[PDB]
Structures are given as C-alpha cells and as structure tokens.
Amino acid sequence: TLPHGHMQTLIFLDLEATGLPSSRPEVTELCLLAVHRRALENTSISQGHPPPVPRPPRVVDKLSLCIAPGKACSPGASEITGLSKAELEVQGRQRFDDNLAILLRAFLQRQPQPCCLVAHNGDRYDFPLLQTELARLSTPSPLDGTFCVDSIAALKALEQASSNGSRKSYSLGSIYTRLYWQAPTDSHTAEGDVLTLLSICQWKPQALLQWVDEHARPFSTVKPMYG
Amino acid sequence: QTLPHGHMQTLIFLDLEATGLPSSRPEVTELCLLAVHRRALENTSISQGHPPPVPRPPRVVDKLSLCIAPGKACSPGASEITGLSKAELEVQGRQRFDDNLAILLRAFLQRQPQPCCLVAHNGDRYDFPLLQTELARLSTPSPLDGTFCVDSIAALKALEQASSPSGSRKSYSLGSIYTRLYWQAPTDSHTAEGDVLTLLSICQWKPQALLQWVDEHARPFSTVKPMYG
Ligand SMILES: Nc1ncnc2c1ncn2[C@@H]1O[C@H](COP(=O)(O)O)[C@@H](O)[C@H]1O
Ligand SMILES: Nc1ncnc2c1ncn2[C@@H]1O[C@H](COP(=O)(O)O)[C@@H](O)[C@H]1O
Ligand SMILES: [Mg+2]
Ligand SMILES: [Mg+2]
Ligand SMILES: [Mg+2]
Ligand SMILES: [Mg+2]
Ligand code: NA
Ligand code: NA
Ligand code: NA
C-alpha cells in the first residue's frame, strides 16, 4: 500500500538562483504549476516513435515570481538565466520574505490535498534551497504538509524499467530530446523549465503518477542546503 | 503635467474567463494576472516596419493564473471558446471564489511596487465589475481597494487614432487589434493567460504613449460598480 495515499495534486516546481550550492545561493525566480492527477490521467498516450510533445492540461494553476536576492548572481548564473540583482532590483522585485510565504501558502491551499512537489534535481538542489529560504523566515514553512519527489529518479525508472547497461544523460534537456526528438524552449527560465518538466512527465502519465505515489516523501524531511 | 495618482510603477495585465455574457449573471472560471514594472515598458523597442514584429515580453514578470469552480454552468459558447466547464473544473478539484483566493491575490499584489494599475481589455464594463461582484460575496476586505484600473479598449483607441489622422469603423476586440497591428493571429484566445499575453503585446505597440495614457486615466478600483448584486 502507498505510504501517503494517492497524490491528488502534482506541483511541478523549478527555481532559478544566484549560483550553485557551494556559493550559498539565493532564489531569483520560482515557478509552480499545479496539476490535478485527473488532468495527467487524461493525457493522450504516445503516438508512436517519436511521440508528439503532449499538450499541457487545460486546467492548471500557475504561479511564476521573480525575487530580488540579497547577494549578486554568479556570472555563470546570470549568463544562463538572464537574471541579475540589477535586473530584479531596478524592476522593484522584493526579497524572499514573509509575504511570499503567505502567497505560497494560499496557492498551495487552493490545491486538493495531498500535494506532491515535482522538481528536476529537486533532491540535491531545489528542495534543499527552498527549505533554506523558508527556514530563515518568521512565517512557518507552508510546505510542512506537502510531499516532494525528484523527477530525475522518476524518469530513470520509467525509462529503464520499461525499455543495455549504457548510461543515459538525465539532464532536463537530454530527457526531453530523447523522448520527443525536439529541442526544449526557454531553457533556464523558471517557467520554461517547468513546462519542459511537465512535458516529460506527460510521457507516461499513469506510470509517472504511480511512481510519485510510491516515492513521495514529506518536504519537512528535506535537509536545508545550508544554514 | 499634473497626474491624478502619480506614475504607475506596476501595470498588472488582467484577464478573466467566466460562465457567460453579462445578462447571464456570470461567475469567474479563470483569472490571470501578469505584473510588469513600468521600466520594462519604458525599455520596449518602438514598433517600426510593416508589419512590426510582435514585441518580446519582458524577462522579469510576475504571473498568477488560476482556475475557479463556478456556482453555475458555463454557457455553451462560453464553454466551447474557453475550453472550460463547471463539471470539469469540479472533478479537477478547483475551489470556488473564496476568502483564501482573496488572500492569495492580496499577497500577489503586495509584491508589486506601488502605485499599481490593473489593465484589462473591456475591463470597465466586464472584468472589473465582475471581479467587484465576486469580491463582494466574500467576508474578507477587498484586496484591490488600493489598486487602480484602466480599460485597454480606450487606450488602444486613443493610440491608434493618434497614429493615423481623421477622418472608418474598426473592431476593438482584443483579436482585431492584435491582427491589425502585427498581421498575426493571436494564440490561445479566450484563455485567461493567452489573452493576457495578447493584451501585453498590443500594449507594447507604443509603450511610452501607453504608459502616459495609463498614468492619465488610472482610477481607483474601489470606485468600480459591481456587475450585479
Ligand atoms: N553553470 C552554472 N553556473 C552557475 N549557476 C548554475 C549553473 N548551472 C545551474 N546553475 C544554477 O542553478 C539554478 C537552477 O538551474 P536550472 O533549473 O537548470 O536553470 C540556476 O538558476 C543557477 O543559479
Ligand atoms: N463571443 C463570446 N460568446 C459568448 N461569450 C463570450 C464571448 N466573448 C466573451 N465571452 C464571455 O466573456 C468572458 C470573457 O471574455 P474573453 O476574455 O474575451 O474570453 C468569456 O469567458 C465568456 O464567458
Ligand atoms: Mg531547475
Ligand atoms: Mg531552471
Ligand atoms: Mg477578457
Ligand atoms: Mg479572455
Ligand atoms: Na529567505
Ligand atoms: Na503511462
Ligand atoms: Na510610444
């Protein structure tokens, strides 16, 4: 039996930030895309080889926010994301603050529970970093009742256990292009990367949901990236 | 040269889908807000060529798009053009327009620099009065009581008439304007996010004149009369 029941809402998540973990980075952009499990189960199943890119579900909740960091972006981060401290501050973006936590809470509370965050490389990056950002706030984390999984492990199972010990790349773009023979769009933007992740999770939608139900773990158990 | 409420620092392009036309007493089924700082509009390339290319949206934007379970069914035409129905919103677990949505909207708005102005196509007769009606049902105070609002139909009418002198009858539907300016068909029409992006594009056509028109005509959302009781 499933450890936490059937997930009713999948929230595809991506973050951009000031740099890589050893720089103690800060979030500069956040996108959440909430999809009911029934929207995934209604995705058309693949049309041969290569299949077409699935279309996103009609009924979706989307939140995309730009966030001013308290430190400069690494050159490598600015180079790929198109974001910098100057871009964000000149356009009046606010810091990762209590009000943001409230916004996230109200967004989550509009989704049927339980919810599971899905992020590519989430276990090593997105989830620990979000935990760090939320832990330094006064508002309690709005995610302590939410679950999470890493889509890297999900797509590894769906690819390996369904079709050669050869290693495959599991970067977000490599997966997308391997499945659909097509280049992702708007790479290294929070929203663009979330839509790419949604497309690869729509590849085998019922298999993905089952794997998520089986591997969802509480977000509260995620260790912060740094203190 | 003396503005009514100062320079608008944030423009929030806004669109709603709903269950039908005003005579049906509609309820909102989808809401999208796209918040753009005024400097992103100041730094938009002006349109030259024929047709001009569709402007690039700003890199830095805040976006909120939410589907909402209505208390009444969509009209057949409304359901077809929007791709939404009451039954499907309910099986996908969408919640009604409620207090928590007002809290979400409030927190979203507070992340934007003030003063802040909603921009909606046909907002003065439809979106703003309908939102006022929806918010009036709630126990929470309106999260829009300090926000301003303008209708982009009037804006584009002013902008287009200034760009070709008088003395015919043109449609000012969202799609007609877009296709007139850019010789392109809009994408994702009659979806809240799609129409908000199309609205952004027409507002970027003459972005300095749009900002000036908005500064001159912004009025408090609190003054909007509800569509119905
Ligand atoms: N080469 C890189 N140099 C610096 N930061 C990077 C690099 N690759 C990824 N990142 C960081 O990781 C964040 C998330 O990556 P992604 O979701 O793949 O765009 C980015 O916003 C950057 O802060
Ligand atoms: N041609 C139309 N026929 C019926 N209803 C419409 C029509 N245009 C707009 N509406 C209604 O008004 C709402 C807002 O219009 P729009 O933003 O142009 O999609 C829609 O969701 C429908 O409920
Ligand atoms: Mg990522
Ligand atoms: Mg990314
Ligand atoms: Mg509209
Ligand atoms: Mg619309
Ligand atoms: Na923080
Ligand atoms: Na499947
Ligand atoms: Na202009």
Author numbering:
A (entry chain B): 5 to 167, 171 to 234
B (entry chain A): 4 to 170, 173 to 234
What does the literature reporting this entry say, word for word?
To reveal the previously unavailable structural information on the mechanism by which the 2′-OH affects RNA processing, the crystal structures of mTREX1 in complexation with DNA or RNA products were determined. With the various RNA or DNA substrates digested by mTREX1 during crystallization, only a single nucleotide is left in the active site. Two structures of mTREX1 complexed with the DNA or RNA product are obtained at 2.0 Å resolution. The structure of the mTREX1–RNA product complex (AMP) showcases a traditional dimeric conformation of mTREX1, with two magnesium ions and AMP filling the active site. The base region of AMP is stacked by Leu24 and Ile84. In comparison with the mTREX1–DNA structure, the extra 2′-OH group in the ribonucleotide interacts with the main chains of Gly23 and Ala21 and the side chain of Tyr129 through hydrogen bonds. The three-dimensional structure of the ribonucleotide with the extra 2′-OH group fits well into the active site of mTREX1, demonstrating hindrance-free binding with the ribonucleotide. To understand how substrate binding depends on the base structure, the ribonucleotides in the mTREX1–RNA product (AMP) and mTREX1–ribonucleotide (CMP and UMP) structures as well as the deoxyribonucleotides in the mTREX1–DNA product (dGMP and dCMP) and mTREX1–deoxyribonucleotide (dAMP) structures were superposed. Our analysis reveals that AMP, CMP and UMP all align well, with the scissile phosphate and ribose in identical positions. To explore the difference between deoxy- and ribonucleotides, a comparison of the superimposed structures of dAMP and AMP shows a consistent binding position, except for the absence of the 2′-OH group in the former.
